[PDB]
Amino acid sequence: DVLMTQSPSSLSASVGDRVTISCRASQSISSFLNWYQQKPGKAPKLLISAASSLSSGVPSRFSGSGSGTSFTLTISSLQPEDVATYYCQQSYSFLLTFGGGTNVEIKRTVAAPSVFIFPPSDEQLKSGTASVVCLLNNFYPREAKVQWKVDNALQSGNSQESVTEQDSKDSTYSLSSTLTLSKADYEKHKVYACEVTHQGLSSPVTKSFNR
């Protein structure tokens, strides 16, 4: 069997930077090496076949090189829409195999999150659970700290976060944090606050309501 190994596992660069991804085969695969682009929950798309043949409609900033056991994909001018996982794949042997992927991210100027807080709906509270939501909109970089305080008591193990894919146009993230409480517990407290720490904000930003 042919084992395909990609390097690096991920990279970040600025718009217009030239970046390269490596693919090595455990044994010679001649020219039979293909590269695909995949955005999350989308079909892969063929970029390059036979090591260096650009698929029709693929921008010229994509190129491929190599033979035998060593291949490279180059992007000469990284664009915001190039954020994706890139996969090599050998078509040499009887049983086909893919490399493990390289995740390509954009570097851009810091953008602080716009922060919003949502109390639980009266509809939800009727059925005995309280979901409190904090939204961080259109920020860069990805790393963000979101803390929940209920009457200034920091909350532990009762919150979950979800993050968007880096935006294909603006290269920003958005993030949701959800605090889950019983209706009984929610009704015993007044001040609900989400506190956000991020590189774009001089001091942590707090959004709060009184029940």
């Binding site: 079909a43 698929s55 040499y92 919003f116 639980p120 659970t129 939501v133 909109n137 979950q160 968007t164």
Partner: protein, 221 residues
């Protein structure tokens, strides 16, 4: 051919089988090789097997030998993959991939993917709650409006806004698995506050496994 169109999301109990279709919409599977490739959660592409109808050949990755059958039906112009004795580990997105029958050819056409969930957990439709901003929040000129889609199984739910009309500045977050074994997600739109005066904002939630179709208008409190 022009477009590989796969069947919708499926949920199966462990031990059951799943048959996924791939229709060569506006084209054929004559003198092509037809592979199935899967992508398990946060993992890479994994080749399962291939048929080349014209040659009467089929092959599988060792780890799928005896588990997968790939069949092509000319009548329906449809390629099928049947995966049997399903386990938790088979929860993934399954893609059909077409290539020329010639040795060495690349996959130039892919289907959109089919999500399969393998679980003994019961199907359950979501409760949809508004994410309503305070008037103080909207007073700054931006209204963040959302819907919390709570306690459903299995994935997926689809969320749209205004039945397809609002896409820009919609963030529909990836689902989270909660400690209950149920999924939740939120979808938010951020719009100029004055637009609350000139149009409705309705979240459209569809959970096909439970036959749930819910519309919720969202307003500040």
């Amino acid at each position: 051919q022009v477009q590989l169109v796969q069947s919708g999301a499926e949920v199966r109990k462990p031990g059951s089988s799943v048959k996924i279709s791939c229709k060569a919409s506006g084209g054929t599977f004559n003198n092509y090789a037809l592979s199935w490739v899967r992508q398990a959660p946060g993992q890479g592409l994994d080749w399962m097997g291939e048929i080349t109808p014209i040659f009467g050949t089929e092959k599988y990755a060792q780890k799928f030998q005896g588990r997968v059958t790939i069949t092509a039906d000319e009548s329906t112009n449809t390629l099928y993959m049947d995966l049997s004795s399903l386990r938790s580990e088979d929860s993934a997105v399954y893609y059909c991939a077409r290539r020329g029958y010639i040795y060495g050819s690349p996959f130039d056409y892919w289907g959109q993917g089919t999500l399969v969930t393998v679980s003994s957990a019961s199907t359950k439709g979501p409760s949809v709650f508004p994410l309503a901003p305070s008037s103080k929040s909207t007073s700054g000129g931006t209204a963040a409006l959302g819907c919390l889609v709570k306690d459903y199984f299995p994935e997926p739910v689809t969320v749209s806004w205004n039945s397809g009309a609002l896409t820009s500045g919609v963030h529909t977050f990836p689902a989270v698995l909660q400690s209950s074994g149920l999924y939740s997600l939120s979808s938010v739109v951020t719009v100029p506050s004055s637009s609350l005066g000139t149009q409705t904002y309705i979240c459209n939630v569809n959970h096909k496994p439970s036959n749930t179709k819910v519309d919720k208008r969202v307003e500040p409190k």
